[PDB]
A paper describes a structure:
To identify the neutralization sites on the HPV6 capsid, we first prepared the HPV6 PsV alone according to our previous protocol followed by vitrificaton and subsequent cryo-EM structure reconstruction. The PsV displayed as homogeneous particles in the view of low-dose cryo-EM images. We finally resolved the structure at a resolution of 5.5 Å, as determined by the gold-standard Fourier shell correlation (FSC), with a cutoff threshold of 0.143. Like previous overall structures of HPV particles, the HPV6 capsid displayed a T = 7d icosahedral structure, with a diameter of 58 nm, and the capsomers exhibited a pronounced star-shaped morphology. Twelve of the pentamers lie on the icosahedral 5-fold axes (pentavalent capsomers), while the other 60 pentamers are positioned at the pseudo 6-fold axes (hexavalent capsomers). The pentamer of HPV6 was easily identifiable, and “suspended bridges” (comprising the C-terminal arm of L1 proteins) connecting neighboring pentamers were conspicuous in the density map. In the structure, the HPV6L1 monomer exihibited well-resolved α-helix and β-sheet core regions and interpretable loop regions. Overall, the asymmetric unit of the HPV6 model had a very similar core region to that of HPV16, with a root mean square deviation [RMSD] of 1.95 Å for all C-α atoms of L1. However, there were prominent differences in the surface loops and suspended bridges in the structural alignment, believed to be associated with genotype specificity. Cryo-EM structures of the HPV6 pseudovirus (PsV) and its immune complexes revealed three distinct binding modalities – full-occupation-bound to capsid, top-center-bound-, and top-rim-bound to pentamers – and illustrated a structural atlas for three classes of antibody-bound footprints that are located at center-distal ring, center, and center-proximal ring of pentamer surface for 5D3, 17D5, and 15F7, respectively.
Human papillomavirus type 6 (HPV6) is the major etiologic agent of genital warts and recurrent respiratory papillomatosis. L1 can interact with cellular receptors, such as heparan sulfate proteoglycans (HSPGs) or laminin-332 on the cell surface to drive primary viral attachment to host cells. The 55∼60-nm diameter HPV capsid is composed of 72 L1 protein pentamers, each consisting of five copies of L1, and an uncertain number of L2 proteins. Crystal structures of L1 pentamers (HPV11, -16, -18, and -35) have illustrated that the HPV L1 monomer forms a canonical, eight-stranded-barrel (BIDG-CHEF) linked by six highly variable loops (BC, CD, DE, EF, FG, and HI).
Author numbering:
A (entry chain E): 26 to 468
B (entry chain D): 24 to 468
C (entry chain F): 201 to 290
The structure:
């Protein structure tokens, strides 16, 4: 039903800032000096693009400027990523830990504060997600216990699966679960320090496969490998005693209980250069969903998260410039670099205009009708109803801080990294490389 | 399969979600009942699919088929496992293990027993599999205790073994490769294996036994992937039992007149995940099956078994019964659960049958107990036939117990238990606005 | 380890091996070469690299900036001492 056009463009930025501290965000209450800039953080970008009915087109002899609209059609998609390779690492300098359970006979008596410096690697991961609708991240928090008996602190609760949109800055889980280590962990010491202040996420694809619009997902790959290195313990008491059915009470020191909690050790394998999905161009020559290149609002969502170039930088600075070697010479400083760019090739679609397909987009999305004009008057939404909002000689209806004002813009508290490229088009494409790579593909 | 006609009717089904969490190692409960059962990654996954009768739905045309002759049924086309968790393995062990010491890097030799039980946690082997069929599958493990019995038994003899072909119930742990055998029976130490394996039974499927009956009620799809490597080596602690023959060894004096370890124990291990090596969310298409059964839910009913190790993570959270204090090791008490996620995405084809005598003979061959659900099976001579003379011997207070013949066999497996799912309700004609029903067009072309 | 003038950024001259103590490592990009519309610096390229992590090590000296007092739970007595969160990949 769409009108496939004839002319293709391209835009790209030149660079994208991401440099600074991997471990955490040091920020004064007056001002921020550097955010937590880490490789493991989710990297979501949104470009803003212009509108093709806004940009005047001189070769418009195909279509009449009243009976038709115009929308872009994203065709060629390409991820720019150009840093040197290398693994990063984090940890916790104070970890609840008895010993290696693998080669040890029994454990000592838990006294006070066996929290020591252990610093651990993470997994391989590379991914991509492209659309004109934001993606959903699925995480958990503690389920509220139901009021049958009063609970004491120190309990196992159940757990609610929480759907949320994905921000920037939050990190991916490393097989430790999309769970609130803010809420569920309560000691601030059991998981590493990079994540202990927050929670981690993961995208659920099957509910993401459950949309009729197609505008949220049409193209997606993944790699993500991992193995487990070691087996250690926690340090503390156990809220659940293991039963005496399948165990035997011993004698002597064996009557003193050993560790029941075991912890794993997530760990990365060898890296690969060849297996990277970066800088291989992709095209929706055919769609898998309901978005046949029809991105809306001149808006794009991209999220690509990587662990491969994750190396964090070491740098020191002298304090006294001493001659004979001391330990009081150099104060430490830790940063970590990231660098990306985005490269995209497009098409157009001139929309045939009736009220039926004007009723189509409302059945897809009602928000962008605010600028999709057609004549603003005859969407006749009005039908018969009693009254909710429009009878105000007030007397029962009141002071109302919340009810209708915080809801209509959903993404304002969604804090994520942004990109503004509303002028970077290109008519001819022999002067741009990846379109020339397309030019042999088109022939 | 050449007696039915492949129709043109194709629908879609969908289960939305299946939330399931629980403690990994054992089940927590009071004395009464379980609200929080033992859930972990390595339990076998027995399920039941339930489909409604196709004749009771108003199919769009009534002329191409005839209900007075035949009673059509669903037929399967292509299904897949929609696994949905972040990838990761969670491990366990047993806090009191039977062991001398390590044999690999033998620093010094041991002397047996004296109760030095060992806390060692280790990983497992890896599996991935999928298995379907209109009848639930049959697994195996080993048994103990019976012989031809000519000789008496002393304290602690050697028993022979016995293979137990048995059904898989859900919650049964899949083995780490040790042995499909009753650990409650053969492992009397109650200490030697990890904690969820100490009392229960691990089992395993026999695929050639699935290849035995040539119908195919237990198999028409069969895909697999497993990997394996063992890291280091152990002993046990105890007594030798059967001694090694010294007829080829040469003994020695000093401390070496004493016996060393003869019992030698592996420590198996797992390799990394390979996310391209999985088999989930890839649409599977079989135009030609492997048994006589070309994908028919005989019973309007199916059985799927798929066990994961990739998303086998354990999960922790810390909690202090204390309000706040200066930090000791006596502050927090710990709790463990284990997340799970499974969903099913289901495409079928309505298939017509025809009624003939050898047809209704063959249903009595296949499962004779099922035609009573069908309606056009009527016996014109009576089966009750007034042998009891239609219940009038005298009924001398028979009324109280007259109803004790109610009805028998309403379930073939009453004591068998497993988790399942209702699917009487999730159907639609045009699957195109559903996911993967557009991928129906790809394979068809 | 990084694309830097290391002897500038490290005044210790002892936190890296020898051939990077007073030198400066570089690494070729692709994209600026991809950006040029002439290609006198690019017409055919390829690469292959493998790496994994052996160990984790530390550095000793003046401490850095710790967390803002809440993600730490303060140790007791001997455990009051806090050290190198400098996490050395290998």
């Amino acid at each position: 039903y769409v009108t496939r056009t004839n002319i293709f463009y391209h835009a790209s930025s030149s660079r994208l800032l991401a440099v600074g501290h991997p471990y955490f965000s040091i920020k004064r209450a007056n001002k921020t000096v550097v955010p937590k800039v880490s490789g493991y953080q989710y990297r979501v970008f949104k470009v803003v693009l212009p509108d093709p009915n806004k940009f005047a087109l001189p070769d418009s002899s195909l279509f009449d400027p009243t009976t038709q609209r115009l929308v872009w059609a994203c065709t060629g998609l390409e991820v720019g990523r150009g840093q040197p390779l290398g693994v990063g690492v984090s940890g916790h300098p104070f970890l609840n830990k008895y010993d290696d359970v693998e080669n040890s006979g029994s454990g000592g008596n838990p006294g006070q504060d066996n929290r020591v410096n252990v610093g651990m690697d993470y997994k391989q991961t590379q991914l991509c997600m492209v659309g004109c609708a934001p993606p959903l991240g699925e995480h958990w928090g503690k389920g509220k216990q139901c009021t049958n008996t009063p609970v004491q602190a120190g309990d196992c609760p159940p757990l609610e699966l929480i759907t949320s949109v994905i921000q920037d800055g939050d990190m991916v889980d490393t097989g430790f679960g999309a769970m609130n280590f803010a809420d569920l962990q309560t000691n601030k010491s059991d998981v590493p320090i990079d994540i202990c202040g927050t929670t981690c996420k993961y995208p659920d694809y099957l509910q993401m496969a459950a949309d009729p619009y197609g505008d949220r997902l049409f193209f997606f790959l993944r790699k993500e490998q991992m193995f487990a290195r070691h087996f250690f313990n926690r340090a503390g008491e156990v809220g659940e005693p293991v039963p005496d059915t399948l165990i035997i009470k011993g004698s002597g020191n064996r009557t003193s209980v050993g560790s029941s909690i075991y912890v794993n050790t997530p760990s990365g394998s060898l890296v690969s250069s060849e297996a990277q999905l970066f800088n291989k161009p992709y095209w929706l020559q055919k769609a898998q969903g309901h978005n046949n290149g029809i991105c809306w609002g001149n808006q794009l969502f991209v999220t690509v998260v990587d662990t491969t170039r994750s190396t964090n930088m070491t740098l020191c600075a002298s304090v006294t410039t001493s001659s004979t070697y001391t330990n009081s010479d150099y104060k430490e400083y830790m940063r970590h670099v990231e660098e990306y760019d985005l490269q995209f090739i497009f098409q157009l679609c001139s929309i045939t205009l009736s009220a039926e397909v004007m009723a189509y987009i409302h059945t897809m999305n009602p928000s962008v009708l605010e600028d999709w004009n057609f004549g603003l008057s005859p969407p006749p939404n009005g039908t018969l109803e009693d009254t909710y909002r429009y009878v105000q000689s007030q007397a029962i209806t009141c002071q109302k801080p919340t009810p209708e004002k915080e809801k209509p813009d959903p993404y304002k508290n969604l804090s994520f990294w942004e990109v503004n490229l509303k002028e970077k088009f290109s008519s001819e494409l022999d002067q741009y490389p990846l379109g020339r790579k397309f030019l042999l593909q088109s022939g």
